[PDB]
């Protein structure tokens, strides 16, 4: 959103949390969390999650829109308060193909997103395809981005075009804090590639550049933002119309989010942390169900989750450790959150629902909430929350959204 | 303390947290929590815990003093910053016995506390003994308090006497205390104390126990309703005393603050401290199940459950009858009857086996977020480590933090 960024550029401490999750409960929580505020909610898909072929979620951009809208309707959240975004749009998942074929799919990808009413468009053709040199000449990155912007602008209706915002650049190094001269060079070459295609107006719609401010996580480690080390970057962006977008901002302290927004990292992408919180809720509720529910009725859902992930290891296998118990500890507790790819699995969905139905039929003792969901227990104590399983899950996800809101709001 | 209450009577928002626990770890947490402040720490025992005959702890009041002091020495807590008190001192343990046998036990109980340097003394002889009318006449309750106070006075040094504070009354009903019944309790105690020659000792009565509308049981908390305790709050302003409130466990930090404001200046906590300790133990046992090799696991939880099922005297009258229900009560009830089992030999050793296993291992961040999320947030902000002992300490500090919010 242009107005929010303009308020930031005029010196207001304000940022936006970009929700990068396809999980329906996470999207429900994101929308519910702001139901009674006036803030816009930003939800973004990656070209892998959703594209013209359905990505891996079986959703086209049009599908994803209606999916989010249907959740919004159920919540009571006005569809117009929703910003939809495309993350890392470009040849990303057609990387193994030659330039022509990957760039043909990328053009139709950008067009699919734009036609579906996605207004925030991240253009990223920094990856080398088959036959390409490694790495790309920075001029080649820019040119390919201009081709993608040209495609967006050409399918846009007049109304959509004026509302389109472009993000450029990538967090991927060609943790290493981005050099100001590389960010400068990324802008300069995008400028030049845009002008070479007559994209003079579209260039004023490039609102953000992606940099690495010094944040990351892997399995059991967080790289905490160090403001002193990002001051050069922070200062460079001030003499532009743009803000920074930061990726992989998950698991930072609420102080860091505030510092980040102060230092002009005003669009903060979150994802794993949201489903990580959801998963902690499900695990907590499953432990509760194991003791509270009669043995013939228990869902067995933790055993189901584990079995599925062990037999279809493809989404986790390249991330986790080899030792057997180490792999289970990772499957369960890694900040990386590779479990997020398995919630759609039919066995997992069925057993989690069985669990939910079971727990909705009985009052959960307060002491079990204190044990397994302590922060929810305290909110129940203060009369702000009920012991309803669905609300306990929401609240778990809200706590992630609360950390961001502290950073992004006044 | 008399100066704390004097500040309160002069209009300052100040309270004190009365820690009613015998657990060494909770006592250690209490002392370490105020290690760097200038606050006094109040630790109280009941007759059941500690008396002439050792109670159930196997500690006389003298033993309990050295036990607190030994913990204070390790923390680096100056012994002089500690206040030792006796809770519900009177014939509660020996109700089954005759009036005069239960009362002789009670005077020797109260003498032993005073001799051992306990400076805060709750006199409560409101229970009916064998041969008594149910309930006792308020005059009778008053009379027996005067007897116990006389016994406390009869043994103090000049120094100890100058320092001796009394509390009177009880929370146990004969629903929020009628101002009238509170006034009647005070009035009768004054008359009985005076009649016993105890006019000077009367000036040393610092508090009366009432019910301000705070309670818990297994899975329910009755939350303090400030507007319902306003009549009580305005009555005590006229008197030389403050209120002491019992069973304040599990309230909000804002209810604690409201309590002190409304002159419930002594707040008694106990089961919430050990409840928190038990949550840390249970979380660590789960972490141990997943991190430690099969041949080295403590079997902590299975030992606890077995021991509690086999020696069930401390919980049997509290918990439910159904077998699974009784397991859920044993684990999770806010009554925390498990607190009586920590000193058992099998439980102690399996808990220490667990701690030894866990101290050699690196606990993944993700597990602490799952099982100890508030501790994880502290680690996340770099104000705590993934050290098992420090994880138990922090669970107990959170209870203590809520009180400090209300009291300081």
Long-range pairs, A386-390, Cβ under 8 A, ≥24: A387/A363, A388/A360, A389/A285, A389/A356, A389/A359, A389/A360, A389/A364, A390/A356
* Superfamily for the B271-394 domain: putative tagatose 6-phosphate kinase domain like (1.10.400.20)
Q: Which residue carries 């989750």 as its tokens?
A: A305
- Smallest Cβ–Cβ distance between A367 and the set B327, B332, B369 belongs to B332
CB B369: neighbour CB atoms within 10 A? 20
Which chain B residues are closer than 8 Å to A367 by Cβ?
A: 218-219, 275, 331-334
Tell me the H-state helices in A294-360: 301-311, 324-333, 346-360
- To one decimal, the resolution in angstroms is 2.2
**Cα–Cα distance for residue pair B89/A65, rounded to 1 Å:** 69
- Hey, what CATH topology would domain A272-395 get? GI Alpha 1, domain 2-like (1.10.400)
- CATH architecture, range A2-271+396-410: Alpha-Beta Barrel (3.20)
CA distance A209 to chain B (A): 28
**Cα–Cα distance for residue pair B369/A336, rounded to 1 Å:** 14
Angle (deg, nearest 10), helices A324-333 and B271-291: 130
Mutate to test the interface with A, among B274, B364, B386 (most CBs of A within 10 A): B364
Q: What is the CA radius of gyration of chain B?
A: 22
Contacts of A4 (CB under 8 A, 6+ apart): A14, A16, A40
For B403, left (φ over 0), alpha (ψ -120 to 50), or beta?
Answer: alpha
- Smallest Cβ–Cβ distance between B373 and the set A365, A374, A383 belongs to A374
Question: Is residue B116 exposed (0-12), middle (13-18) or buried (19+ Cβ within 10 Å)?
Answer: middle
Contacts of B94 (CB under 8 A, 6+ apart): B101, B102, B105, B106, B129
Whether B271-394 and B2-270+395-408 are alike in CATH topology: the answer is no
- Does B222 reach chain A within 8 Å, measured CB to CB? no
Q: Are A402 and A395 in contact (CB under 8 A)?
A: no
- Does B157 reach chain A within 8 Å, measured CB to CB? no
- Does A223 reach chain B within 8 Å, measured CB to CB? no
**Cα–Cα distance for residue pair A218/B9, rounded to 1 Å:** 56
Residues in chain A: 410
Q: Are B388 and B394 in contact (CB under 8 A)?
A: no
Instruction: Provide, for chain B, the percentages of residues in helix, strand and coil under a 3-state DSSP scheme, each rounded to the nearest 5.
Output: 55, 15, 35
DSSP bridge pairs for B358:
none
Contacts of B289 (CB under 8 A, 6+ apart): B297
Helix (H) or strand (E) holding B329: helix B323-332
Domains in chain B: boundaries: 2-270+395-408, 271-394
DSSP, residue by residue, A8-22: HHTT--B-EEEE---
Which chain A residues are closer than 8 Å to B290 by Cβ?
A: 325, 328-329
**Cα–Cα distance for residue pair A270/A85, rounded to 1 Å:** 13
Q: What is the CA radius of gyration of chain A?
A: 22
Residues in chain B: 408
- Does A332 reach chain B within 8 Å, measured CB to CB? yes
> Which has the closest alpha carbon to B349: B286, B303, B396?
B303
Which chain B residues are closer than 8 Å to A365 by Cβ?
A: 218-219, 328, 332-333
**Cα–Cα distance for residue pair A78/A187, rounded to 1 Å:** 35
Q: Are B87 and B118 in contact (CB under 8 A)?
A: no
End-to-end CA distance of chain B: 14
**Cα–Cα distance for residue pair B16/B7, rounded to 1 Å:** 12
Which residue precedes each gap in chain B (C to N above 2.5 Å)?
174
Instruction: Provide, for chain A, the percentages of residues in helix, strand and coil under a 3-state DSSP scheme, each rounded to the nearest 5.
Output: 55, 15, 35
CB B231: neighbour CB atoms within 10 A? 14
- Smallest Cβ–Cβ distance between A371 and the set B218, B221, B332 belongs to B332
The torsion angles phi and psi of B87, rounded to 5 degrees, stand at: -100, 135
- Does A334 reach chain B within 8 Å, measured CB to CB? yes
> Which has the closest alpha carbon to B347: B290, B277, B249?
B277
Tell me the two tokens of residue B126: 């409101």
CB B114: neighbour CB atoms within 10 A? 24
Could you tell me which chain B residue has the CA closest to the CA of A370?
Answer: B279
**Cα–Cα distance for residue pair A45/A36, rounded to 1 Å:** 25
DSSP, residue by residue, B348-400: HHHHHHHHHHHHTS---HHHHHHH-HHHHHHHHTTSS-S-HHHHHHHHHHHHH
Distance (Å) of CA B139 to CA B87, B144, B148, B201: 21, 9, 14, 18
Tell me the H-state helices in A127-199: 138-155, 158-163, 180-195
Burial A226-262 (b: 16+ CB within 10 A, else e): eeeebeebbebbeeeebbbbbbbbbbbbbebbbbbbe
- Does B58 reach chain A within 8 Å, measured CB to CB? no
> Which has the closest alpha carbon to B285: A335, A280, A371, A377?
A371
Question: Is residue B383 exposed (0-12), middle (13-18) or buried (19+ Cβ within 10 Å)?
Answer: exposed
> Which has the closest alpha carbon to B167: B143, B147, B149?
B149
Residue A199, SS3 per DSSP:
coil
Strand boundaries in A1-112, DSSP class E: 16-19, 41-46, 82-89
DSSP state of B125: -
Question: Is residue B180 exposed (0-12), middle (13-18) or buried (19+ Cβ within 10 Å)?
Answer: exposed
> Which has the closest alpha carbon to A271: A197, A181, A194, A336?
A336
- Does A382 reach chain B within 8 Å, measured CB to CB? yes
* Superfamily for the B2-270+395-408 domain: Aldolase class I (3.20.20.70)
Tell me the two tokens of residue B381: 């902000």
Q: Are B185 and B146 in contact (CB under 8 A)?
A: no
DSSP, residue by residue, A374-394: HHHHHHHHTTS----HHHHHH
CB contact under 8 A, A253 and B380: yes
């Amino acid at each position: 959103m242009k107005t929010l960024i303009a308020r930031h550029k005029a010196g207001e401490h304000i940022g936006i949390c970009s929700v990068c999750s396809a999980h329906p409960l996470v999207i429900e929580a994101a929308l519910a969390f702001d139901r009674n505020s006036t803030r816009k909610v930003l939800i973004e898909a990656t070209s892998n999650q959703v594209n013209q072929f359905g990505g891996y979620t079986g959703m086209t951009p049009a599908d994803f829109r209606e999916f989010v809208f249907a959740i919004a309707d159920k919540v009571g959240f006005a569809r117009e308060r929703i910003i939809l975004g495309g993350d890392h749009l470009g040849p990303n998942c057609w990387q193994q193909e030659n330039v022509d074929a990957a760039m043909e799919k990328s053009v139709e990808l950008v067009k699919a997103y734009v036609r579906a009413g996605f207004s925030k468009i991240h253009l990223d053709a920094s990856m080398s395809c088959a036959g390409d040199p490694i790495p790309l000449a920075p001029e080649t990155v820019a040119e390919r981005a201009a081709v993608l912007c040209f495609a967006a602008e050409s399918v846009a209706t007049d109304c959509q075009r004026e509302q389109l915002s472009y993000v450029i650049g990538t967090e991927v190094p060609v943790v290493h804090i981005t050099h100001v001269e590389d960010a400068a060079n990324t802008l300069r070459t995008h400028q030049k590639a845009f002008i070479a295609r007559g994209l003079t107006e579209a260039l004023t719609r490039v609102i953000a550049i992606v940099v690495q401010p010094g944040v990351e996580f892997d399995h059991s480690n967080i790289i905490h933002y160090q403001p002193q080390e990002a001051q050069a970057l922070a200062q460079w962006i001030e003499n532009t119309r743009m803000v920074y977008e930061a990726h992989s901002t998950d698991y930072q302290t609420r102080t860091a989010y505030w510092e980040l927004v102060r230092d002009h990292f005003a669009i903060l992408k979150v994802g794993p942390a949201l489903t990580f919180a959801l998963r902690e809720a499900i695990f907590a509720l499953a432990q509760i169900e194991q003791e509270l529910i009669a043995p013939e009725n228990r869902s067995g859902c933790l055993a189901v989750i584990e079995e599925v992930m062990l037999d279809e290891p493809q989404y986790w296998k390249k991330y986790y450790r080899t030792g057997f118990n180490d792999s289970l500890l990772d499957i369960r507790y890694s900040l990386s959150d590779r479990i997020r790819y398995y919630w759609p699995h039919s066995r997992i969905k069925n057993s989690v629902e069985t669990m939910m139905v079971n727990l909705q039929g009985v009052d959960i003792p307060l002491g079990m909430i204190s044990q397994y969901l302590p922060k929810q227990f305290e909110r129940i104590q203060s009369g702000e929350l009920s012991a309803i399983p669905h609300q306990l899950i929401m609240d778990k996800i809200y706590d992630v959204l609360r950390a961001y809101r502290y950073g992004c709001a006044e």
